[PDB]
Every structure is written in C-alpha cells, then in structure tokens.
Amino acid sequence: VQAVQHVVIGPSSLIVHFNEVIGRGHFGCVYHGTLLDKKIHCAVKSLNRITDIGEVSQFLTEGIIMKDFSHPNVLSLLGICLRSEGSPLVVLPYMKHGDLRNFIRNETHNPTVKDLIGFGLQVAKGMKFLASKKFVHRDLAARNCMLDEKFTVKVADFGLARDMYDKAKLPVKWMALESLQTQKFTTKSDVWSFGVLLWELMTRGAPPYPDVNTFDITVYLLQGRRLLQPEYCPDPLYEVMLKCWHPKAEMRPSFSELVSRISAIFSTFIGEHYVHVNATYVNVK
Ligand SMILES: CNC(=O)/C=C/c1cnc2ccc(O[C@H](C)c3c(Cl)ccc(F)c3Cl)cc2c1
Ligand SMILES: [Cl-]
C-alpha cells in the first residue's frame, strides 16, 4: 500500500502499443509504451505468469530493489503496472540505440577502438555498482546491455526484465569454468562473462567460439583454450580479457580493478583507429 507507492504506475497512465513488438522472451513480449504525467516513451514487458497473491507482491519486491539500482550504467525501472485485467506490466526507460550487440554489428556505424573500450568501460562501472550491492548478474553479454540516446551503456536483463531474448537455456559461452562445473555464480563469475563481453566489443559482436560446440565448452576451456586476440584489440586489453578468464575465481580482477585498468587503456586512444568487421566472424549464428 503506502510504502510500495513510489514504484506503482496506474493503468490509466500507461498506453501499451500492442501492435509494435520490440522483443520476444520466454516469459512475455516487449512493446513500445507511452507513459504519462506529458508523453514519455518507454518499453513495456508483459508477464504471462501473474495470478498469485504472493507473486504479485513478490514482483513488487524486485520492483522496490530495481528502483534502488539507479546508476548511469545500470538500466533502471520506471515502474510496474498492476492491472486487474490479466497481467502486470514492467515499464522500462526506452533505449534509443537498443542493445549493444546489434549496435556494434550494424555495418552503417564506424566505431573506433576508443568508442568500443569506452563501452567496455561503461559496463565495468555498472557492474562495479552492482557488485558493490552484492548483486550477481549471472547473464552478462553485449546483447543484454543497452545504449541510450547519449551513448550511455546500461547493464540490463536483471530483476523483472530477466529473460532469454536471443534467437541451450544456459548461455554457456559466457559462463565461467566453475559455473559450468557446479552451476554456482558469484561476482567473479560475472568477471569471466565481462571478459567475453570485451571480446564481443573488440570483434564488433562476433559470436564467441564459432567453431566450438555448446556442449563441448568445458572440455575446450580445460584443454588450455581461450578466445583469440581480436585484430583491433590492444595488447593490454587482451591481457585484461585473459585475467578475467583465470581458471581460479580468486585470481580474477575485481570490477574495481577493471574500471581502473580499462580507464588507463581508454585514456590513450583518441578516435584515430576505425574498427571494421573481421572476415572469419562475419555472418555467423
Ligand atoms: C534501434 N533501437 C531499438 O531497436 C531499440 C529497442 C529497445 C529500446 N529500449 C528498450 C528498453 C528496454 C528493453 O527491455 C527488454 C525487456 C530487453 C530486451 Cl528485449 C533485450 C535485452 C535486454 F537487456 C532487455 Cl532489458 C528493450 C528495449 C528495446
Ligand atoms: Cl582510437
């Protein structure tokens, strides 16, 4: 009732545009939306699940939490909409440039080594923020990072917005060695995923490990193998990737140390080096 109020949006304030789908998910669809009080453009996820007395309240809990995760590099919640008609709708700010994987794959764009590391740096700061609240993402990947009108990168795909959106149910190519072996996740397993994220950035969104079977990944990693240095990835940034993929989670750098190190590397690049898609990775599912 009273305390919950800063989250809740009235059904009367929300116009969901059901004709205009943004994204398909296991747990519902995403559509453009219009929020009022003024016309604010938003994205609106419909959740199929809802009917429980508990889980309508429980989706109120993560709503409160998500509202407390405001940081420029983290995707925030506008509100939740509790409709007596059918389902509850998660209302998210609208991200002009959509997801980071598709932004860098788009062959109409010309990012430089500087822009790409800048994006990597922005994710590192969101994750630093998340990690400091003791929150483990479990599914960090370029596709799950958003990019707004000012080129702010927002770490996304957590809380009530959590799904698998890509065209099996575990994203094995981004998962740390120990998560694959024990199914358990920590900040240090997000650091591994983050390393794979920097690789996607430096390859402008190539699928990691194209030659490698999804069920063979553990054996691949235990044989001595890692993602190659991308053509345009600086040495010191590749060194950072390798550190993120240390086999022992304690030895991996913290997100604090990632922001500090990547900053150093960022401060040296000035938009002289244009990044272009590599021949081997181009057009691969
Ligand atoms: C060229 N720009 C676009 O296509 C933009 C689309 C857009 C713009 N803003 C968005 C804001 C939130 C959003 O959330 C959904 C549930 C989502 C999706 Cl569909 C995919 C990955 C994610 F990390 C998230 Cl959070 C999806 C959004 C999608
Ligand atoms: Cl550059």
Binding residue ranges for ATP = 22-30, 45
Whether 99 lines ligand 1, by a CB cut-off of 6 Å, is yes
- Tell me: do 30 and 153 sit in the same domain: no
Bridge partners, 39 (sequence order): 36
For the chain, the domain total comes to: 2
Find the domain containing 39 and state its range: 1-94
- Tell me: do 3 and 118 sit in the same domain: no
- Tell me: do 44 and 163 sit in the same domain: no
Question: Are the CB atoms for 199 and 119 separated by under 8 Å?
Answer: no
- Tell me: do 46 and 99 sit in the same domain: no
Q: What CATH number corresponds to the domain at position 57? A: 3.30.200.20
- Tell me: do 141 and 197 sit in the same domain: yes
- Out of 73, 94, 115, a domain closes at 94
- Tell me: do 141 and 82 sit in the same domain: no
Determine which residue's CA is closest to atom 19 belonging to ligand 1. Answer: 23
d(CA 42, CA 236): 39
Smallest CA-to-CA distance from 163 within 74, 15, 30 is with: 30
d(CA 206, CA 120): 15
Q: What CATH number corresponds to the domain at position 169? A: 1.10.510.10
d(CA 202, CA 277): 9
Question: Are the CB atoms for 46 and 31 separated by under 8 Å?
Answer: yes
Q: Which ligand is nearest to the CA of 45?
A: 1
Would residue 148 show up in a list of annotated catalytic residues for this protein? Answer: no
Q: Is 8 left (phi over 0), alpha (psi -120 to 50) or beta?
A: beta
- Tell me: do 143 and 209 sit in the same domain: yes
The pick from 22, 77, 105 for probing ligand 1's pocket by mutation, whose C-beta has the most ligand atoms within 8 angstroms, reads: 22
- Tell me: do 142 and 276 sit in the same domain: yes
Q: Tell me which residue has tokens 């304690």.
A: 250
- Out of 79, 94, 109, a domain closes at 94
Catalytic residue among 99, 139, 157, 190: 139
- Tell me: do 74 and 124 sit in the same domain: no
Three-state DSSP class for residue 106: coil
- Out of 60, 94, 128, a domain closes at 94
Cited resolution, angstroms: 2.5
- Tell me: do 22 and 33 sit in the same domain: yes
